Write a protein that binds this ligand. Structure first.
Ligand SMILES: [Zn+2]
Ligand SMILES: [Zn+2]
Ligand SMILES: [Zn+2]
Ligand SMILES: [Zn+2]
Ligand SMILES: [Zn+2]
Ligand SMILES: [Zn+2]
Length: 395
């Protein structure tokens, strides 16, 4: 998938050109043509079809700078360099900041060409607040250009064609190019958005045999209650027993005036929400992973976390995929490839959260590796079979 990242500088460059191209025989001052293009959404044809048709002191600070700080606008008003700097800078701040800036006397209202607003502003954050502001239309109207999602990031990704794949901004944020959300791989874009419009989950649940209470620290859904009386184990999501889990016959990832909708809804959210809380917990696991690394030999251990973390992601997205799925013969398969993956994940999650330091030092490499290789290989079958899925339309 062909994709490129550009700085606010480069996109401004590109726009500047697209303007200059369009400047004959129209011959307008570059900034007026921008407004005009920006106004037509950058269809250049629609602007054209419509074009052939028809349509020695300084009076601000008061110090005397001799002649050389004095650049003026076309209206003959002549003000000093530092003074402009402040005028522009404070005018590009809220509120009412447009796609332009009028001359400061405000009597004349004749706008200040872009280039000089690039030359004269000093501290470059503001110079960025502008480049964004004047560029924003150029970018939004083109289908090969999308701004990067992060709030404080002014970069833009530019693609060959608008395909809904992941893109990385060196932001270092990654996102779907189509919908601009986080990368979703099993699920379709429209569905995700709908699911988002909806989205409790009970950090406190009680052990089913002894009715004791356990708040959840981590992150693994294989729980072993702490008691002398009952040392028994159970899944967090169904409060039923491990470990018939992830064997063919018990499946904890599958569902049976209609309240049924608001009932079964709670099935899939409860799951997606809980794989999230699970992913949250799995993340504070990184800081812990610098410690027990004690070089190549000893970093498979970031991977385990990388892979465990990755799988929690794909799982949430697989419940979103599944909720909007109407049952059919592939449903029953994907619903299985899921269960394999959910189990491979609870097993590895549970090994890094719990069973590992309660294990010896020699052994932990052999185990962690196999555990996350299988985990990752499960996760790929899930995905490859839904992909081949999307190809036949089967859903
Ligand atoms: Zn001045
Ligand atoms: Zn003026
Ligand atoms: Zn970014
Ligand atoms: Zn998307
Ligand atoms: Zn118990
Ligand atoms: Zn369960």
């Amino acid at each position: 998938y062909r994709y490129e990242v550009l700085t606010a500088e480069q996109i401004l460059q590109h726009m500047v050109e697209c303007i200059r191209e369009v400047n004959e025989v129209i011959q307008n001052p570059a900034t007026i043509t921008r407004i005009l293009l920006s106004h037509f959404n950058w269809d250049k044809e629609k602007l054209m079809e419509r074009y052939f048709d028809g349509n020695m002191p300084c009076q601000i600070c008061y110090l005397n700078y001799p002649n050389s700080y004095f650049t003026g606008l076309e209206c003959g008003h002549k003000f000093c360099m530092q003074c402009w700097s402040e005028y522009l800078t404070t005018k590009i701040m809220e509120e009412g900041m447009g796609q332009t800036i009028s001359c400061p006397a405000h009597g004349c209202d004749i706008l200040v060409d872009d280039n000089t607003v690039m030359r004269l502003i000093t501290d470059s954050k503001v110079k960025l607040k502008y480049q964004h502001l004047i560029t924003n239309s150029f970018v939004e109207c083109n289908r090969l250009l999308k701004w990067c999602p992060a709030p404080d990031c002014h970069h833009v990704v530019k693609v060959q064609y608008p395909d809904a794949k992941p893109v990385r901004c060196k932001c270092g944020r990654q996102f779907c190019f189509n919908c601009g959300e986080n990368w979703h791989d099993p699920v379709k874009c429209k569905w995700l958005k709908k699911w988002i419009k909806k989205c409790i989950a009970a950090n406190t649940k009680e052990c089913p045999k002894c009715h004791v209470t356990i708040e959840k620290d981590g992150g693994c859904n294989h729980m072993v209650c702490r008691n002398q009386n009952c040392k028994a184990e159970f899944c967090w999501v169904c409060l039923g027993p491990w470990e018939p889990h992830g064997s063919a016959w018990y499946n904890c990832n599958r569902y049976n005036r209609s309240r049924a909708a608001l009932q079964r809804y709670l099935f899939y959210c409860n799951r997606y929400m809980n794989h999230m809380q699970s992913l949250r917990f799995e993340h504070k696991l990184y800081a812990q992973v610098k410690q027990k690394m004690e070089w190549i030999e000893v970093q498979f251990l970031k991977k385990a976390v990388d892979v465990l973390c990755q799988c929690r992601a794909t799982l949430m997205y697989t419940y979103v995929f599944a909720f909007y799925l109407k049952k059919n013969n592939q449903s029953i398969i994907f619903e299985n490839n899921q269960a394999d993956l959910e189990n491979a994940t609870e097993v590895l999650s549970g090994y890094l959260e719990r069973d590992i330091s309660q294990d010896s030092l020699q052994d932990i490499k052999q185990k962690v590796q196999d555990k996350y290789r299988y985990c990752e290989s499960r996760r790929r079958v899930l995905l490859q079979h839904v992909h081949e899925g999307y190809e036949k339309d089967l859903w």
